[PDB]
């Protein structure tokens, strides 16, 4: 799976493919890896278990209620619980979550990372996506969405675990 | 890679995809895995190294000169040399080779196998292809080529190491 | 083992084989892998412990009583407790469950999955069944049952862990 | 160890050898691997720890008190507890248990298996015993006991972890 | 990563690089590895989870409030809870913390360590920094800062996991 | 390391970085990975032993003298001896070689490969270069050189085994 | 073992420690790891077997006779033979060799490396030595010998496989 | 690390080196591995974690309060708790502890060992120390301290994980 | 280590050696592996932690007080708590315990074992003792003691983990 | 397999069992592991391959022709060839060979061993046999043959890879 | 095994133990590890194959005849052929050889080594001997012999692979 987030001109997106792999075979090709949270004010993508994600995203909206939409703070409370809690600790996922404020990554290792230009590329195909996203951001006037999409397809072309089915969520605050 | 051979009504084909994988990434998407040998009277596909194949196919045409096109005999002489010879022994490939006479597999283990209905499906995607080829052969009046193709695409859909680029070689003796 | 579900024309089936393996030998050849549930309105197949099964399917029916036949909801509840309950967590299986509404998979991870066309193929022989089910579904008029069947035999013919003993549970609705 | 159960003409037996192996050496040659439970109405054999078995068999008689001798039901309650309970989970054994009703296997994996003709053959020598038991059941008019015994000796001859010391328990309901 | 502390002439620094690695690729190049604490009387560098850090440094300040700036004591308290608390135990990091009093390391093992000359060099690039810090400290008049710097660049020049983005937190006292 | 070749508008380049790694440290930062050959009519990049290189590129030029600049043919000859000669077999590398005719890869396996659009990206940083080269090639008018460059920096920015020292060998023909 | 070569002001040195380690114990503390070759015009150090080195250095003087003291050329002929020859291939060492012309490393992988300022640091302690050598070269007016020595001692202090026994060979061409 | 205890003529000592090793590098050279406990009436050395030791030694003084300085009894209570307690169980150290009564070793395996002449030599260098201590005790009239010291240095000379920094604690009861 | 029990003519002994090993060296040569219990009516040998032992044998005596010398019963109780109690579970050993009644083994698994002729041989040298004890028992009139002895020396002569220091605890009854 | 040689009163024997084990199963129970060589003047047993032995014993008779029956000399010539020769090196066996002169072992490691009293016990059951043989030799007036036999049976009783089928060869020179 | 050489006051000895081990048991207890050579002017000890030895020591004497007693030279010749000759290469051992001139080690690697004070300690018990030899050599007036002896016993007392059977070969010269 590959998940890409690009942010440009009051527009931030999160795109992901839809391949689920079991060993050396495709189990499902249309997994929805990107969704909306917190009255649609937040976009998010995840690598790994769907139910695992469902649980982590729910908790996140929760932490968000507790910090008035402050992305980062609620983001850390989750990176906090995630590593402490005996149950959450067992969960396995890679969260990519964004809003008008900022974009960031959330790992089970109690980490909240905010890459260089809010450019996120997680998943087995992450780096390939990042590489293309980078090339495009710095040499074309393309939109966030256009980049996320063209980047993700490139990833899809190189990464054996990423396909071409997409799901995109956008956020405009301009 | 997946290679499928189907034989129906004086028509025998050999189809293969074109993915070359390095670790978890696609190195090349249009590898030509099927070709012609012996004044076009023989069709052949291979899993593994291209140069490796080139060497083994050359020798095969050779063995064919030595047995007047007798597929099987020349096939075994190759399965013979392949395991004995200090150099060939190092080669690694999976040969699928056919003519109007019969279709067969040739392994470095000095094996020449002729599956149940001349139906061959080698490669990481082999079984998936075989399964579809089987379903189609026994429930539709489709041509060899149609089956090889539809089977290969199915393989391509399931196998993470097989793509949708095809190369087909057909032989009509009707 | 191999479990295949197929829904075509107001008919939806679940078919499984009967091999129980241990190491490299067959412990049992007639295991019942497909049963009925919720006053025979729901069908289901399972890969795993026979008792494991008996506890999950019971709980399911239970969840169905709590959501009046709403397949999905109960399904999500089950997958919900399954990954939470300290007792249920140790249980291991692969339920394939379906009714006139929809077909779907439940994995101990807590995932409820709805494959592309209500086509389910779980178990080591899973993909070989899928491959053949797909090929039949897209190139013949055969009935949902006939497909599960033929697919399953093909699975059993390739998978060293799947045999030819079958169990089918159909369901007509239109 | 090898444990064989055969049932023929209102006569069901359970036979087992008596070897205990430590690494590559025989630690004990007369281990009693078969015994009686529930006012002698039930026969049982076990592969693995003696104390482990003692604990599991005790609980089983218990579950039997709770289900009026209903073998199967009490059998599952045990396959249930066995996988759930934090303590039992650590136990390691393979239970073979029979009565006039039916014979079955009970694994720590929450499994209760009833082989094809109530023919059970568990243990490193299981398959060899099964193979002989099968040959004898279908080609001679021999008693359950005669088969169990001759089968077990054959196992003993082939399996390096099974000896020729026997313990048999029989049950006649004719 | 690489964290270097150096104390010479009433000046004590902590300098770290900014590389975040995952597998064989760079996830982030500008991580803030060195921050300030206890009303900016204390400096500190950390190798590990960004949130992990945020929880430890907070607790530290907390411990400092309980021992009025007594670096060491608070440091021992922190290392004390860290290996005891069921939540804190799962946290993983490497704090380098220091003030005019003394410089020191705190490891999740519960160790508070005071290296030979308040010279700290933690992280995969640790020793290459040490090696160069030592060489500068013993053969030049350079300032504490200048050393941490130069040392760190040298570290980044050798360590595949350390880069040239820096973060320095000085402290003058005399 | 990372070697990128790119051919656009009668211009074809080969660009490589200069990092030499050993374990987790940098042994050299300025290795010359791209040189010229055949009286400067041919360009080439190589990943591997510096002497290894020196023997292969020499032999190549030699093969070119035997096929009057026919890139491909010489290339096949080289790949031919390389897998045969008892001395050459032990040599390990990855040549990327190209001229106005065509660009291509030669692997010790004996393979001569011509990637989709004369786009070559070999080395651990290979795919990150590819990903970015592809993105630039398909969304900007940039020159072949400019792409190799930018691509390579992006590679070096992600790959822990690739740096920013470059070596470029262009070639104009039209 | 650690071997350091520094070159400054018409003065080039090669210093090495003298520890030989067997498992976790010191077998010998005064191994002579540096010596002179080719009528004293060449200095050299080696990591690994003494006899192994003796053989490789002999051959090197030989190759030197064949190339009129041309260090580099003779250096490559050795990196050539070393990887080809069936006997030499088995040898295991790391050669560091210098003259007034230049300093370089010679590996069994058919590699001849000339680090950035003729600064060589091979051996388990290599990097630590390099780091100190670097710090000293760029911040003090110290001689080659002084650096090699102070660097080597630092290495010795950090590397568990390097001691403080030294052997130095110098070369003055000023 | 190496820890040696020798007892001769109403004089018992405990000597240890001060090396802390991280992988293949020296992290600290002056670790204090020997200390005093219980109003100075008890001497003690430890191999492993400092904080780990701190915790175990504290508890030991405690157990000592509970058994009126009876070394052995309090020693066993600690070997008792150490293996039982869920927390202590995780601790890792090797205790060497002595008083005028006797000297002994205390392992996490619930073991309290009193070597042949109160001669203790634990740590990676233990055996080498023991060997020298033995030679000296039985062939010279040297004091406990002299032996501990000369033995420890020998260890230090042979063991790659032991240095020459010492800490000694003596006890005179004559 | 090696523990041998032998009962012949109203005499029953337990004999063990004294080697304590760690890695490939001898930590102690005089460990007391055989002691007395229950007001010296019962003898016993143990392989394992010295403190571990001290806790088990105490509990045993305790159990004996609860079943008036009924060796077996107490033995079963001990083996019962041993595998249940959360504290006792972590304890590891091998008790050989016996009296005029009977001889037997107790393993942390919870097993109480009575070997063929009250002949016990536990420990790495176990079988070599058994082999010799058996040979003496069946071909000579030697006393129970004399056998344990001679057997044990033979054990010590073969087993690298067993020495010639002995501890014997006899018992006459008739 | 177990092979025992005993020599007493001008009588020397070689006894061996007859089990051949494949994995965990008995493949053959009457393998002849002992035979005669050199006009019956020499007795011999072997552990391992039969054909392997056949080849080694043939060569031995040969070496014997070349050294006039001098056991030892011819024995070493074989231990010589065995390790040198490119073909013999691949052979795997354990030779036990005796004559009136002396008994000895011959390993592929170029070793010729003459145990303490010409007492040989090789094979997985070797030690158990040796232990019994020892006990018997030093406490009974039994013949060589009686010991070899009783020892071998004991081995057979303990060793899971040795059975009770025997082959004995004796030699009387009195 | 353990071989100790010690030269003090015109006396030089070589002493070895006699244990031959295989797995975890003793195959022989009286192996002769120290012999004489070159018309008894030279002494030597060896760790390894008994025949292996016999071939090396012979060749040595041979080399000595070619360099008139020049220990070192012959020693270098031996180490020279040893790593070259296709036959000798497979031989494995550890010669310790010495005369009035000097003492030294020869390893199959081709190394001739002269340890610090003609003190040799090879074999698994090597360092424990060294440790004690050093301690005696530096703190007592004992003779070379007496040291080798005492050292060796100490070795045998610690090393599980070394025993107390000795073989000493002295040499007086002054």
Architecture overview:
- Chains A, B, C, D, E, F, G, H, I, J, K: Pfam families: Proteasome.
- Chains A, B, C, D, E, F, G, H, I, J, K: It is an enzyme of class 3 (hydrolase).
- Chains A, B, C, D, E, F, G, H, I, J, K: Keywords: Allosteric enzyme, Cytoplasm, Hydrolase, Metal-binding, Protease, Sodium, Stress response, Threonine protease.
- Chains A, B, C, D, E, F, G, H, I, J, K: One of its GO terms (cellular component) is HslUV protease complex.
- The structure is cut from a larger assembly and holds eleven copies of chain A (174 residues).
- Chain A is α+β, with helices and mostly antiparallel strands and 174 residues long.
- Helices cover 33% and strands 31% of the residues of chain A.
- Chain A has one domain (1-174): Aminohydrolase, N-terminal nucleophile (Ntn) domain (Glutamine Phosphoribosylpyrophosphate, subunit 1, domain 1, 4-Layer Sandwich), CATH 3.60.20.
- The first copy, chain A, has helices at 50-65, 71-84, 126-137, 144-158; strands at 2-7, 11-16, 20-22, 25-28, 34-37, 42-48, 93-98, 103-107, 111-113, 120-123, 167-172.
- In chain A, the strands form three sheets. Chain A has a five-stranded antiparallel sheet with strand order 5-6-7-8-9. Chain A has a four-stranded antiparallel sheet with strand order 10-1-2-11, with helices on one face.
- In chain A, helix 1 crosses helix 2.
- The radius of gyration of chain A is 15 Å and the shape is globular.
- At the A-F interface, helix 3 and helix 4 of A face helix 3 and helix 4 of F.
């Amino acid at each position: 799976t590959t998940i890409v987030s690009v942010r440009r001109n009051g527009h931030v997106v999160i795109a992901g493919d839809g391949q689920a792999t079991l060993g050396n075979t495709v189990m499902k090709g249309n997994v929805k890896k990107v969704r909306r949270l917190y009255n649609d004010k937040v976009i998010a993508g995840f690598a790994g278990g769907t139910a695992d994600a469902f649980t982590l995203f729910e908790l996140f909206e929760r932490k968000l209620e507790m910090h008035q939409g402050h992305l980062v703070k609620a983001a850390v409370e989750l990176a906090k619980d995630w590593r402490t809690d005996r149950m959450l600790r067992k969960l396995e996922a890679l969260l990519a979550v964004a809003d008008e404020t900022a974009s960031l990554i959330i790992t089970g290792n109690g980490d909240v990372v905010q890459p260089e230009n809010d450019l996120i590329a997680i998943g087995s195909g992450g780096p390939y996506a990042q590489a293309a996203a980078r090339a495009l951001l710095e040499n074309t006037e393309l939109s966030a969405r256009e980049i996320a999409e063209k980047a993700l397809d490139i990833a899809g072309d190189i990464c054996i675990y990423t396909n071409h089915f997409h799901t995109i969520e956008e956020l405009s605050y301009k």
